Structure formats: structure tokens, C-alpha cells
Amino acid sequence: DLELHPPSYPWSHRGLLSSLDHTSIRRGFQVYKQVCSSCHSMDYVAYRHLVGVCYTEDEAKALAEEVEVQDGPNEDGEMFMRPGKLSDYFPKPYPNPEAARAANNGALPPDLSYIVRARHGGEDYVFSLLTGYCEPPTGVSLREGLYFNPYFPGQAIGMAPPIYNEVLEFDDGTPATMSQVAKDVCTFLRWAAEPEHDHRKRMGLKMLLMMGLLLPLVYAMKRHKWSVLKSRKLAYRPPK
Amino acid sequence: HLVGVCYTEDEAKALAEEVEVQDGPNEDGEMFMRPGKLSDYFPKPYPN
Amino acid sequence: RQFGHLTRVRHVITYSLSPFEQRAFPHYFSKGIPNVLRRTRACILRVAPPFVAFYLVYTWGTQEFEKSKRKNPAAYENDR
Amino acid sequence: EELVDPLTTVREQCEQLEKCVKARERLELCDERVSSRSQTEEDCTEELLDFLHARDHCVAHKLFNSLK
Amino acid sequence: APTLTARLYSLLFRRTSTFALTIVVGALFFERAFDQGADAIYEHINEGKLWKHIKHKYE
Amino acid sequence: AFKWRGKPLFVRHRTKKEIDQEAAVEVSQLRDPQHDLERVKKPEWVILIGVCTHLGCVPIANAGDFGGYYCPCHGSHYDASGRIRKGPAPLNLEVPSYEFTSDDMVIVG
Amino acid sequence: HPLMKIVNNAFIDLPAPSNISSWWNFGSLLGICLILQILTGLFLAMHYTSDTTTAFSSVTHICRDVNYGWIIRYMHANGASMFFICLYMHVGRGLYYGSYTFLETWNIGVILLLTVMATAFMGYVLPWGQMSFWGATVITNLLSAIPYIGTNLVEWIWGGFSVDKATLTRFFAFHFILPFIIMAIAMVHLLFLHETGSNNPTGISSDVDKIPFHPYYTIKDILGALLLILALMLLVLFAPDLLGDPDNYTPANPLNTPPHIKPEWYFLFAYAILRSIPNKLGGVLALAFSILILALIPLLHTSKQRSMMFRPLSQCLFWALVADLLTLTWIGGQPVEHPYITIGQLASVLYFLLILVLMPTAGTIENKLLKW
Numbered sequence: 017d018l019e020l021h022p023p024s025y026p027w028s029h030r031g032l033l034s035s036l037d038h039t040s041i042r043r044g045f046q047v048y049k050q051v052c053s054s055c056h057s058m059d060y061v062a063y064r065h066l067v068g069v070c071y072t073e074d075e076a077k078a079l080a081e082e083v084e085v086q087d088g089p090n091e092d093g094e095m096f097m098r099p100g101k102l103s104d105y106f107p108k109p110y111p112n113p114e115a116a117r118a119a120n121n122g123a124l125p126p127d128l129s130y131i132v133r134a135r136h137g138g139e140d141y142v143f144s145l146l147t148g149y150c151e152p153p154t155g156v157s158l159r160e161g162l163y164f165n166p167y168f169p170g171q172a173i174g175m176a177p178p179i180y181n182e183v184l185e186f187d188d189g190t191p192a193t194m195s196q197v198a199k200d201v202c203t204f205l206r207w208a209a210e211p212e213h214d215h216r217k218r219m220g221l222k223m224l225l226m227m228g229l230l231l232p233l234v235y236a237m238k239r240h241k242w243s244v245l246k247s248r249k250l251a252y253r254p255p256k
Numbered sequence: 257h258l259v260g261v262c263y264t265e266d267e268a269k270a271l272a273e274e275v276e277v278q279d280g281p282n283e284d285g286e287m288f289m290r291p292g293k294l295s296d297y298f299p300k301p302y303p304n
Numbered sequence: 305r306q307f308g309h310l311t312r313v314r315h316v317i318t319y320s321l322s323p324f325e326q327r328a329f330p331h332y333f334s335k336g337i338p339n340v341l342r343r344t345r346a347c348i349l350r351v352a353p354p355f356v357a358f359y360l361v362y363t364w365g366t367q368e369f370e371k372s373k374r375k376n377p378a379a380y381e382n383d384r
Numbered sequence: 385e386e387l388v389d390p391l392t393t394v395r396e397q398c399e400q401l402e403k404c405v406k407a408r409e410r411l412e413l414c415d416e417r418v419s420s421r422s423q424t425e426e427d428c429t430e431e432l433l434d435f436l437h438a439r440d441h442c443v444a445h446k447l448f449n450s451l452k
Numbered sequence: 453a454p455t456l457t458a459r460l461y462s463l464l465f466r467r468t469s470t471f472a473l474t475i476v477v478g479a480l481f482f483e484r485a486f487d488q489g490a491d492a493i494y495e496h497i498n499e500g501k502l503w504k505h506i507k508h509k510y511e
Numbered sequence: 512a513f514k515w516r517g518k519p520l521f522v523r524h525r526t527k528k529e530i531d532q533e534a535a536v537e538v539s540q541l542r543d544p545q546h547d548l549e550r551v552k553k554p555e556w557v558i559l560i561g562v563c564t565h566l567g568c569v570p571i572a573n574a575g576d577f578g579g580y581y582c583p584c585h586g587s588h589y590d591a592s593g594r595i596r597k598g599p600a601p602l603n604l605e606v607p608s609y610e611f612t613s614d615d616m617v618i619v620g
Numbered sequence: 621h622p623l624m625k626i627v628n629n630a631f632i633d634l635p636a637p638s639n640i641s642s643w644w645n646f647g648s649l650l651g652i653c654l655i656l657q658i659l660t661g662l663f664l665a666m667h668y669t670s671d672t673t674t675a676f677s678s679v680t681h682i683c684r685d686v687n688y689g690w691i692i693r694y695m696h697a698n699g700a701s702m703f704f705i706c707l708y709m710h711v712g713r714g715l716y717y718g719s720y721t722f723l724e725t726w727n728i729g730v731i732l733l734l735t736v737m738a739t740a741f742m743g744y745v746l747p748w749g750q751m752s753f754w755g756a757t758v759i760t761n762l763l764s765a766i767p768y769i770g771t772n773l774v775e776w777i778w779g780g781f782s783v784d785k786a787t788l789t790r791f792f793a794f795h796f797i798l799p800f801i802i803m804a805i806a807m808v809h810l811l812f813l814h815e816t817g818s819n820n821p822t823g824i825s826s827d828v829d830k831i832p833f834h835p836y837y838t839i840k841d842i843l844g845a846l847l848l849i850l851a852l853m854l855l856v857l858f859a860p861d862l863l864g865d866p867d868n869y870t871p872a873n874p875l876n877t878p879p880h881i882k883p884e885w886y887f888l889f890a891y892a893i894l895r896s897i898p899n900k901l902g903g904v905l906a907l908a909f910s911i912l913i914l915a916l917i918p919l920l921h922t923s924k925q926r927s928m929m930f931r932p933l934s935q936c937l938f939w940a941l942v943a944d945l946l947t948l949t950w951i952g953g954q955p956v957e958h959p960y961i962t963i964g965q966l967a968s969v970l971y972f973l974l975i976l977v978l979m980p981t982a983g984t985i986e987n988k989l990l991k992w
């Protein structure tokens with residue numbers, strides 16, 4: 017019943033004009049697909065969103081095609097499966113929340129689309145949750161289905177450690193260590209929650225530059241106009 | 257909707273109860289059937 | 305309420321100058337920074353102490369909240 | 385071949401620091417307290433969290449230097 | 453001698469008719485100039501991290 | 512837990528040992544003084560509106576100190592009959608109006 | 621020509637005072653905020669849907685898929701806050717400089733505040749996140765504390781026995797329209813102001829020294845508009861989730877209450893005054909009176925000087941009232957535990973004591989010092 021606030025991990029995309037690491041997103045997606053996809057929903061992303069961010073259109077289409085998803089109704093009046101497409105949203109692991117709580121010890125694995133924006137701390141919290149698994153100290157006797165992680169609010173998380181050294185292998189030939197996985201997937205879950213992130217900071221730069229240009233120019237016009245009054249000199253001259 | 261128009265509450269409830277309709281999800285995470293009720297809309301003949 | 309019907313003003317003379325004839329920023333850092341400072345000295349005593357008092361109550365209250373959140377030495381100590 | 389995570393290097397490097405080992409001292413001192421008592425309703429979470437907070441602050445300072 | 457800024461006033465923006473033509477054309481050029489510059493600044497700030505830098509890679 | 516009138520409806524079948532446990536709890540000790548019997552219509556089946564009486568906050572069952580539930584917001588602990596034990600909450604959990612149609616079906620409201 | 625003459629006497633050659641500080645710029649900014657909320661809001665409603673099935677999906681659809689939908693959303697969401705910052709400046713200015721002596725202008729003001737509070741509250745429900753749902757469920761239920769009809773009043777408001785799809789859809793209808801009632805009220809706010817003229821920082825009749833609104837205050841209000849835009853776009857582009865709560869990105873769920881439950885930042889002072897009193901009805905009446913006491917301010921005025929410019933005791937107590945509000949805003953944000961309960965209790969009493977007891981006495985003493 018005590019708080020443990022995460023630290024300030026210096027991300028690639030931390031500063032005011034600092035963009036997302038699209039190769040790290042690329043790997044971070046693979047971490048979702050390979051590891052987090054089997055348990056966790058990501059309802060508000062489709063394979064077309066990946067195009068021009070971390071993958072090409074053809075590459076992203078191939079990944080959609082890999083998985084098979086429902087479509088219909090057909091002419092007979094029934095549903096059938098077909099290979100996925102750019103327009104398909106990412107496959108949900110279970111049909112509903114009750115199937116999740118059935119499958120996972122009465123615990124709902126939450127949707128990872130907005131998880132960074134949904135929790136306090138964001139990537140720092142998600143990273144410290146993933147990498148920060150440790151043993152329960154003397155006194156802390158947890159029950160069935162539970163694991164000790166200190167960064168989680170209740171100290172007793174219902175999630176098995178999801179990532180460990182070389183749980184997957186990256187296509188670009190990067191050393192798949194536990195903290196490298198955590199880094200990449202958190203860099204991806206940022207993008208899932210805030211895809212506007214790069215474009216928004218560019219607008220930011222352009223806004224600061226343009227405000228830097230205009231504010232003195234407008235202030236100069238204000239001063240130029242008000243000058244008449246600000247320099248004026250009042251002389252009282254009554255008669256006798 | 258039938259109650260107070262053409263039937264009583266008890267009569268209308270019996271007719272709802274005659275037919276069986278879907279409800280859920282349950283705790284296992286799946287759908288099941290149950291006898292109909294006043295709040296159930298009339299069963300659609302086909303799914304689409 | 306219009307220019308002409310506002311009020312009775314007598315024996316005043318207003319000397320003005322065209323904005324193109326005069327400067328926009330006349331003695332800005334020269335005369336201004338002292339004037340800004342003077343204005344700051346005038347107000348500070350009236351304005352600041354409540355915000356200081358807020359800061360004291362703020363940090364203290366957060367400090368005392370963190371103290372009360374944490375463990376205490378009477379929790380089952382000298383009591384097996 | 386077996387692989388190694390910079391995390392485990394940087395964590396042991398950061399565990400060197402005075403405040404880390406001082407929290408670690410109180411954690412160990414708690415562990416023996418809770419162990420030596422007969423039956424209690426008490427734990428050593430606080431001191432683990434003090435330790436981890438002091439450590440992971442330092443971890444974050446130089447962990448990402450190793451990662452890409 | 454005709455000065456620097458007076459030479460602009462005299463021929464470019466004395467009339468309000470040409471004043472606007474100057475602004476419009478100046479704004480037309482400014483847009484190309486500024487966007488291009490601030491894009492390049494943002495892209496140099498964020499070197500190698502955007503898609504356009506790693507696009508040749510997978511294409 | 513059920514979505515009833517938008518509110519959580521906590522129907523609770525209590526184990527034979529747990530039923531007379533709450534009967535074994537003494538009546539003048541509670542902030543809002545009530546015996547278990549004056550809250551329940553069938554000893555095994557107690558039902559409650561799952562809303563903390565301090566401020567609207569959904570409790571969690573099989574949690575807290577006693578056998579009933581707990582409130583996350585400011586730590587109000589309840590017992591298996593729904594009665595308030597630990598503060599800062601003022602009153603016992605609100606029992607709805609209900610009756611049993613047959614041995615298997617129950618109706619609330 | 622009948623319209624231009626209205627716009628002349630309004631904005632072109634309206635005689636303004638010569639010595640008006642930047643504290644009078646907030647009026648024009650509040651209109652710019654109102655127009656910004658209207659224009660952004662309209663474009664959000666073009667894609668937003670008010671059904672509990674689709675409400676969340678629609679807001680995320682805007683951010684993700686509607687071209688530049690995100691920038692419109694956060695301009696609405698942070699502009700809402702900028703509107704409120706501007707309001708609290710605009711209200712305080714009048715408290716300081718004695719502008720409440722334009723009774724009708726001020727009392728229309730007091731209405732304008734309340735309508736925006738209702739607008740923004742109902743607006744916050746719309747996206748249908750946890751904090752939006754649970755904010756409504758908490759704040760609305762307060763009315764059940766009313767003596768004899770509150771429990772009915774609440775169910776009528778909701779359209780059922782809880783916050784639900786009935787409530788959300790009407791809350792959208794009320795949001796989309798009440799801004800226009802606000803703009804209508806605001807034109808009457810201005811209408812009484814031209815009757816009475818405008819105030820200046822000295823609190824001394826500036827008929828002797830007037831200047832035409834244009835070109836002076838036109839270019840000044842333009843300058844101020846850029847500073848408001850800057851402040852908005854800093855929030856929108858660098859810190860869009862700063863003032864907002866994270867829990868509202870978790871879709872709403874009536875079977876699971878978030879632990880740290882609260883309104884948005886602009887109601888936290890009033891939320892803290894409500895929490896101060898333990899009795900429910902008392903908490904509601906104090907919550908109400910915290911806002912509505914603004915209407916008693918012109919009756920509580922005592923000093924023979926109008927403005928606080930020449931009034932030390934009043935200035936200190938005014939700046940105390942600001943700090944005390946910032947204390948209450950802080951306390952409202954924190955949970956209801958020690959020591960925040962006692963700080964909130966004292967802060968809440970201090971709030972009403974400054975307004976009702978002290979600042980009038982200060983003015984009365986200030987008179988006696990100057991032989992009044």
C-alpha cells in the first residue's frame with residue numbers, strides 16, 4: 017500500500033523537438049506481435065497505420081496476410097475466415113472481457129493502444145513494470161495467480177513476467193536482451209497511444225519559430241501606435 | 257409493448273417465456289440460452 | 305456617451321508627436337529595467353508573502369503526507 | 385552462446401553506491417527482524433522500495449547508454 | 453542618395469494596392485522558404501530516426 | 512457483481528460457517544448498529560448494492576480485513592453481511608428490496 | 621449603415637480610458653476562447669457520436685484517422701482550460717479594481733461563469749472515459765443531498781437510475797447549444813458595459829482622458845491574442861496530456877471506480893470547499909455559495925476608494941484570497957487524508973472569512989486612516 021514512482025529513463029523521443037525512433041518502433045511492434053499479442057488487446061491500430069512509420073506498404077500487407085480473420089456474411093448467410101489486410105485492425109486475443117478473466121485467473125489484461133497515456137508515468141512506468149520484476153520480500157506472501165512487481169500499485173500483479181532475455185529474435189539482427197525488448201516495445205506503445213507524436217513536435221518547432229518572429233513584430237506595431245500617447249506631454253495653463 | 261394493449265403483464269410474460277433467446281457473456285466467457293422475458297424484443301427469424 | 309459629450313475639460317494643452325517622426329522603443333533597457341524594478345519593489349511586499357505562505361504549507365503538507373504514508377516504529381516493535 | 389543484459393551490469397554497478405547499500409543495510413536489518421519474530425503482520429516492502437528507488441534512479445542514468 | 457528601406461517604400465509599398473501584392477508574393481515565397489528550412493532543422497535535429505532516413509533500408 | 516440500475520449489485524452466497532460468523536459478531540460494536548438477521552432475508556444469500564457510503568466508490572469483495580469487502584478510495588472495510596467496521600465511512604452497505612420467486616430465482620426491486 | 625454604426629460605437633471609436641493595463645485584455649480573449657471552442661467543437665461534432673457503444677471509438681477515430689483530428693481535439697480540450705484561466709483572471713481583475721460596481725455587467729458575468737462551468741462539465745462527460753463517467757456520477761449525485769426532491773431531480777437529470785446512455789446523449793445536446801446561449805448572454809454583458817463605460821486601474825472617472833478603441837486597443841488585443849494562442853499551442857503541441865487526467869484514456873466502466881476520483885483542475889477549489897464540510901447538504905450549499913458569493917461582492921464593498929490600487933490592507937487580503945484559492949485548488953487535487961483534511965478545512969473557512977468578514981473591515985479601517 018505504498019507508492020514506487022518510476023525514474024527518468026532518457027528516451028530517444030524525450031525532448032521538445034525529439035522524434036520517435038522508427039527502427040525502435042519497428043522492433044517494438046515485433047515485440048507486441050510475438051510476445052504481447054497472445055494475451056493483450058490493441059483495438060485501435062490496424063496494419064495500414066504501420067505503413068510509412070515502421071514498415072512499407074508491401075511489408076505491412078504481408079504481416080496482415082500472415083494472420084487470418086473473420087469476414088461476412090457470405091451468400092449462404094454465414095461467416096468465414098480470410099487472410100488479413102491493411103484495413104484490418106489487430107486481432108483481439110479473446111472474444112470478450114469475461115473470456116480474458118476466465119483465461120487469466122480473474123484478471124483482465126488491458127488494451128495496449130492507449131496504455132502509455134492511460135497510466136501515470138507512461139513509458140517510464142511500463143519499462144519499470146516490465147524490467148522491474150523481482151522477488152517478494154520477507155512478509156509479502158502473495159496468493160495463487162499473482163507475481164511480485166514493486167512498480168505496480170498493489171505490489172501483486174496478475175501478469176507472469178512477459179519478457180525475458182531473447183524471448184524473441186529481431187529481424188534487423190539486434191541483441192534481443194530483456195531491457196532492449198522493454199525499450200523497443202515502450203517506444204512502440206508510445207506510438208500506438210500517440211501516432212501524431214513526430215508531426216506534432218514539428219508543428220511545435222514551426223510554432224515556436226513563428227511566434228518568435230511575430231510577437232516582437234506585433235509588439236513593435238503596438239508600440240509604434242501607442243508611441244503618440246506614451247511620449248505626450250500635458251501642460252496646464254489656467255487664467256488669472 | 258403488448259402489456260395493456262392486447263395482453264396482461266402475466267399473459268405477456270408467459271408468451272415471452274415460451275420462446276428461448278440468447279444472453280451473455282457468462283463467467284466462462286461464452287453465450288447461453290434462457291427463456292424470454294418482457295424486456296426481450298421479438299426473436300428475429302435469421303441472423304442476417 | 306460619445307467623443308464630444310464625455311465631460312467638461314478646460315485650460316489643458318496636449319503636445320503629441322507622429323509615430324513615424326518618433327521612435328517605437330525609446331530608452332527601453334535604459335529607463336525601463338529600473339522602472340520595472342521600482343514597480344517590483346512597490347508590489348512585492350503586498351503580493352509575495354501569501355504565495356510564500358502557500359509554498360510553506362504546500363511542501364510541509366506534502367512532507368507530512370509522505371511521513372504519514374510511510375512505516376512507523378510502534379508497528380509491532382518490542383512486541384513479538 | 386549465452387547472452388547478457390546491460391541491465392544486470394548497471395544494476396550491480398549502481399548497487400555499489402552509499403545510499404543503495406545503506407537502504408540494503410536497513411532491508412537486511414528488517415529481513416532478520418521479520419524472520420526472528422514469531423508471527424507478525426509486517427513486511428519489508430518499504431525498505432526494498434527505498435533500495436530499488438535509489439538503485440533504479442542510477443540505473444536510468446546509464447542503462448540506455450548500452451541499449452540502442 | 454536613395455536609402456535601403458526608402459527604396460522599398462517608394463516603389464514597392466507606398467500604394468496599398470502594391471502593399472498587398474508584396475505581402476501575397478512574399479508570403480507565397482516565405483511559405484516555401486520557412487517550411488523547407490524548419491523541416492530540414494527538425495530532420496537534422498532528429499537524424500536517422502524518421503522513416504525517410506530508414507526508408508532506403510526496406511525498399 | 513451485476514449491472515443493476517447502472518449500480519453494482521453484489522449477490523453473495525455465504526458458506527455455512529461464514530453465515531453464523533456474522534451472527535456471532537456483536538451488535539453494539541458496529542458504527543451503524545445492526546444484527547445480520549435484520550439485513551438478510553435468507554441467511555445463506557445476502558445481497559447488497561456495491562457502493563461505498565462515504566463517496567460513490569465500488570468496493571472489492573473477498574478483500575480487506577473481514578470476510579466481506581473493501582473500498583480502495585479511502586480504505587473503508589466491510590464485513591460479510593455488508594456492515595461497516597472501519598472508517599471513515601458512515602453507514603452499512605445499502606440492502607435493496609428483494610424477494611425469492613422460487614428456490615432458484617431471486618428478484619430485486 | 622445601421623450595422624457599421626453599432627460596430628463603430630462597439631469597436632472602432634468607443635471612448636476607452638487611456639491607462640488600461642493588460643488585465644482588461646482577458647475579456648476579448650474569453651470571446652476568442654468561446655469562438656475557438658465553438659469552431660473546434662463544431663469540427664469535432666462532425667465526427668463524434670453520442671452513443672455509449674461508439675463514443676470512445678469516435679474520439680479515438682478523430683485523433684487517429686480524421687485528418688488533423690488530433691490537433692482540433694487538443695485545441696478544444698486545452699482551449700477549455702485556457703478559457704477557464706482567462707475567466708479566473710477576468711473575475712479577479714474586477715474584484716481588485718472594483719469593476720463589480722457595474723452591477724448588471726458583473727451579475728451577467730456571474731451567470732456567464734456558471735453557464736461555462738455547466739458547459740465544460742457536460743463537455744468532459746462526452747468522450748466517455750473513466751474519469752468522465754465517474755466525474756459525472758460523483759458530481760451529479762451531490763444534488764440528492766437536497767432536502768425533499770433531490771433524489772428525483774437527479775434521476776430526471778440522468779434519465780434513469782444512474783449515469784448512462786440517456787445522460788451522455790443529452791449532455792452532448794446541452795454542450796453543443798449552451799455555448800450559443802453564452803454568446804447571447806455575452807452580448808448583453810457588453811451591452812450593459814457600453815451604458816456604464818469601461819473602468820481603469822486607478823478607479824477614477826477617466827472621462828477627462830479618453831482615447832478611441834481603434835487603433836490603440838485593437839492592436840493591443842491583437843498582441844494579447846497571440847500570447848493566448850502561444851499559451852494554447854504550447855499546451856497543444858508540447859504538453860496536450862498535462863492538464864488532463866490519464867484515467868480518461870481507460871474506457872468507462874461502472875463496475876470499477878478509479879481510486880483518486882476528482883473533477884478537472886478548474887473545479888478543485890470548489891471541490892475542496894465541498895469536502896471541507898462533512899454534512900452532505902452543507903457541502904453542496906458551501907460548494908454553491910463558493911461561486912454565488914460573487915453576487916454579494918458589490919454589497920460587501922465598503923471603501924470610499926473604488927480601486928484597490930491605493931489600498932494596502934485590501935491588496936494583501938486580495939492576494940491572500942488568491943493564494944487561499946490556489947491552496948484549495950491544490951487540496952482538491954489531493955486525496956481526503958491527513959494532513960489535507962485540516963488544511964482544506966482552514967483554507968475553506970479562510971476563503972469565506974476573507975470575502976465576508978476581513979476585506980470589508982480592511983476597507984472600513986482604510987477609510988478611518990484617511991479621515992473618511
Ligand code: HEC
Nearest residue numbers: 047051052055120123124125126131142173174175178201
Ligand atoms: C499473458 C499470457 C500475458 C502476456 C504474454 C502479457 N501480459 Fe500484460 N497483463 C496480463 C494480465 C493478466 C494483466 C492484468 C494484471 C493485473 O493484475 O491487473 C496484464 C497487465 C499489463 C499491464 C497493466 C499494468 C497496470 O498498471 O494495470 C501492462 C502495462 C501490461 N500488461 C503490458 C504487457 C506488455 C508490454 C507485454 C508484452 C511485451 C505483456 N503485457 C504481455 C497478461 C499478459
Ligand code: HEM
Nearest residue numbers: 657658661662664665668697700740743744746747796799
Ligand atoms: C465554452 C465552450 C466549450 C467548452 C468550455 C467546451 C469544453 C469541452 C471539454 C472540456 C471537452 C472534453 C475534452 C476532452 O478531454 O476530450 C469537450 C468535448 C467536446 N466538445 Fe466541447 N466545449 C465547448 C464548446 C463546444 C461546442 C460549441 C461544440 C460543438 C459545436 C463542442 C463539441 C465537443 C465535442 C464533440 C466534444 C467531444 C470530443 C472530445 O472529447 O474532444 N464543444 N468540450
Ligand code: HEM
Nearest residue numbers: 644647648650651714719720726729730732733806818819
Ligand atoms: C464568457 C465569459 C466572458 C466574456 C466573453 C466577457 C466579456 C467581457 C468583455 C469583452 C469585457 C470588456 C473588456 C474588459 O474590460 O476586460 C468585459 C468586462 C467585464 N466583465 Fe466580462 N466577460 C466574461 C466573463 C465575466 C465574468 C465571469 C464576470 C464576473 C463574474 C464578468 C464581469 C465583467 C466586468 C465587471 C467587466 C468590466 C471590466 C472593467 O472593469 O472595465 N465577466 N467582459
Ligand SMILES: CC1=C(c2ccc(Oc3ccccc3)cc2)C(=O)C2CCCCC2=N1
Nearest residue numbers: 630631636640644647648651652818837841
Ligand atoms: C467593448 C470593449 C472591448 C471589446 C472589444 C471587442 C470585443 O469583441 C470580440 C469578441 C471576440 C473576439 C474579438 C473581439 C469585445 C470587447 C475591449 O477589449 C476593451 C478593452 C479595454 C477598453 C474597454 C474595452 N471595451
Ligand code: FES
Nearest residue numbers: 563565566582585
Ligand atoms: S469513498 Fe469509500 S472510503 Fe472515502
